[PDB]
Design a protein around this ligand. Structure first.
Ligand code: HEM
Ligand SMILES: Nc1c([N+](=O)[O-])cnc2ccccc12
Length: 289
């Protein structure tokens, strides 16, 4: 199964920078969302969930086809709460109707990471909307009540190795869990992209507790939480080494996360040899906007 990137007709870097800027301005404007976290974290989660359906064995799922727009995927219990990110992007899509849905959902994650002071994430255009029958079934996204061996095996289907897994999980510094969405609660209100997930894993005094949904999660008195799959990264000795590496090297984490997150958003896509090079968008702050 081959998905060839096809640039939206006549469009170039400046077109996509305009889309980036509209998302970034809206992120700034809609500050109240989720107790003043803003939409950044949910947009990162959205970009990950639309990509994380991918199966390297047959190239089903993945970001290319924009299939999150269809009810079967929109309504995946694993996607509960992402409707907020979709609604945020609706007016952006109306302003720029020429962008494909996969391009918009993935660009929303890039824009969110960068506007939250994260690394630059190079981004390529050319995902093309595919039909409703190409929507992957529910159940391809990961469970949170699982150990390190589950995490490791799960991510092999996305062609991610231990370093890529631990780097990607650093996005869990952002935002929070919501009981009604996932059966987990808490995490704070962070909307700045840092390596603090790793520092918190190593430095907080974690207690294994049951939440109001009767699920176990790790809580600290300082008010952080870790999912069982987050805490697995310090239970497994191979993951632990990499956690320590990122807790001690902000720049290395940024570089590794940027590579892994681009790769995640591009899995499944064939880029022609004469496709444009990846775009690196300027933040609003870099543009004086
Ligand atoms: C084993 C893998 C993972 C599991 C089990 C997992 C699970 C979860 C769960 C249960 C939530 C809370 C959803 C809610 O209640 O609203 C969440 C939130 C989030 N996840 Fe993950 N996740 C995983 C990997 C990732 C990755 C790879 C990324 C992106 C690189 C990511 C980014 C986020 C973000 C940013 C949020 C916060 C959303 C918000 O504040 O609304 N997650 N994740
Ligand atoms: N804030 C978070 C933390 N945290 O360390 O506060 C840990 N795990 C999370 C998983 C999903 C969303 C937010 C998380």
């Amino acid at each position: 199964l081959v998905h060839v990137a096809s640039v939206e007709k006549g469009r170039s870097y400046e077109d996509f920078q305009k889309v980036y800027n509209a998302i970034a301005l809206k992120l700034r404007e809609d500050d109240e969302y989720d107790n003043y976290i803003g939409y950044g974290p949910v947009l990162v989660r959205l970009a990950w969930h639309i990509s994380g359906t991918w199966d390297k064995h047959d190239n089903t799922g993945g970001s290319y086809g924009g299939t999150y727009r269809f009810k079967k995927e929109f309504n995946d219990p694993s996607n509960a709460g992402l409707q907020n990110g979709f609604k945020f992007l609706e007016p952006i899509h109306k302003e720029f109707p020429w962008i494909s849905s996969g391009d918009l959902f993935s660009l929303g994650g890039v824009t969110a990471v960068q506007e939250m002071q994260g690394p630059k994430i190079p981004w390529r255009c050319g995902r093309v909307d595919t039909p409703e029958d190409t929507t992957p079934d529910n159940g391809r996204l990961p469970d949170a009540d699982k150990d390190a061996g589950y995490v490791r095996t799960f991510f092999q289907r996305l062609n991610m190795n231990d370093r890529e897994v631990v780097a990607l999980m650093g996005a869990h510094a952002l935002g929070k869990t919501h009981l009604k969405n996932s059966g987990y609660e808490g995490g704070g209100a962070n909307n700045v992209f840092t390596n603090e997930f790793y520092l918190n894993l190593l430095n907080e005094d974690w207690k294994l507790e049951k939440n109001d949904a009767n699920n176990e999660q790790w809580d600290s008195k300082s008010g952080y939480m870790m999912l069982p799959t987050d805490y697995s990264l310090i239970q497994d000795p191979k993951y632990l080494s990499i956690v320590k590496e990122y807790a001690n090297d902000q720049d290395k984490f940024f570089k590794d996360f940027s590579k892994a997150f681009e790769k995640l958003l591009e899995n499944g896509i064939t880029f022609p040899k004469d496709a444009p090079s990846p775009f690196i968008f300027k933040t609003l702050e870099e543009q004086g906007l």
